[PDB]
Each structure stands twice: as structure tokens, then as C-alpha cells.
Amino acid sequence: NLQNIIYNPVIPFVGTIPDQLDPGTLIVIRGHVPSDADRFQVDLQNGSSMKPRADVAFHFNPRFKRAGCIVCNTLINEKWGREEITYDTPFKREKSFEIVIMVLKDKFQVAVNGKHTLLYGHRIGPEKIDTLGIYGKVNIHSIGFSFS
Numbered sequence: 001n002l003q004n005i006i007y008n009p010v011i012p013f014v015g016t017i018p019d020q021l022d023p024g025t026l027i028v029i030r031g032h033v034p035s036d037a038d039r040f041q042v043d044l045q046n047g048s049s050m051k052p053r054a055d056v057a058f059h060f061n062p063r064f065k066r067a068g069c070i071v072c073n074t075l076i077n078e079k080w081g082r083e084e085i086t087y088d089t090p091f092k093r094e095k096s097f098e099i100v101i102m103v104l105k106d107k108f109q110v111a112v113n114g115k116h117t118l119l120y121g122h123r124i125g126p127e128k129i130d131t132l133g134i135y136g137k138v139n140i141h142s143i144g145f146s147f148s
């Protein structure tokens with residue numbers, strides 16, 4: 001029902017993904033936003049190079065300034081594509097969360113706490129994702145996977 005569970009990873013976290021992100025796969029991330037968070041991001045990456053920065057197939061970036069939002073994008077050759085902004089964000093400072101990223105054939109479907117949050121169409125074949133990055137101001141209790 002969940003495997004390869006990592007507990008209380010230090011952030012910034014970079015970790016190799018166990019198996020392939022095929023349709024049906026779930027990535028489950030449970031955590032808590034620190035009272036002073038400005039933003040954090042979950043990146044599904046092709047590799048872990050820092051300079052040059054590895055490509056990010058799916059950058060999921062809750063931001064907490066202003067009214068707060070979530071920005072989703074794809075980084076290729078150190079350049080960002082078209083941003084998809086979601087203004088209805090379930091993330092709050094000092095509040096805990098469960099993020100479920102479901103890999104569908106055509107898109108990612110993201111729900112927080114069991115409620116649908118956003119969709120993001122595949123720009124890179126998800127089969128090429130091999131690394132999970134979590135950066136910014138966030139406390140992660142656990143990361144887990146349920147493949148296929």
C-alpha cells in the first residue's frame with residue numbers, strides 16, 4: 001500500500017525514485033509548513049545535477065506570500081516553460097498536509113488531504129523521471145510510493 005518510505009528527510013531533500021513512474025503510480029508526501037515559510041517545492045527531476053541544474057519534469061511550488069498560490073512548470077536546459085498558476089491553494093503556514101501525486105497517462109493529478117487540487121499535463125514522458133527533490137521551507141514527515 002506504500003513502499004520505500006523515507007522518514008523525516010532533511011530539507012533540501014534529493015532522493016532517487018525506486019521504480020518507474022508509470023500510470024497509476026502514486027507519490028505520497030506528508031508534511032507540515034513551518035510558521036515562517038515563504039515557499040517550498042516538490043520537483044520530479046531527470047537526474048540530480050546542481051550546476052547545470054537537472055531538468056524538472058514537474059515543479060510543484062506552493063508559495064505563501066500575498067494571497068498564496070501554487071505554481072507548476074517544467075525546467076528544460078535551465079529554462080522554465082509556461083507556468084500554470086493555481087490560486088485555490090490548500091497550503092497554510094503551520095498546517096499539515098498530505099500530497100498525493102497520481103501519475104496518469106496524460107497528466108499528473110494532485111490532491112491534498114483527499115481533495116483535488118490541480119492537474120498538470122505531461123510535457124516530458126514521466127518514464128524519464130528518476131529523482132525527487134523537495135526544497136524550501138517545509139517539514140516532511142514521510143515520502144512514500146505505490147507503483148502501478
Ligand SMILES: OC[C@H]1O[C@@H](O[C@H]2[C@H](O)[C@@H](O)[C@H](O)O[C@@H]2CO)[C@H](O)[C@@H](O)[C@H]1O
Nearest residue numbers: 041059061071072073074080081082083
Ligand atoms: O515557473 C517556475 C519558476 O518561477 C520562477 O519565478 C517566476 C515567477 O514564478 C513568476 O510568476 C514571476 O512573475 O517571474 C519569476 C521569473 O522566474 C522561480 O524563480 C522558480 O523558482 C520557479 O518556481
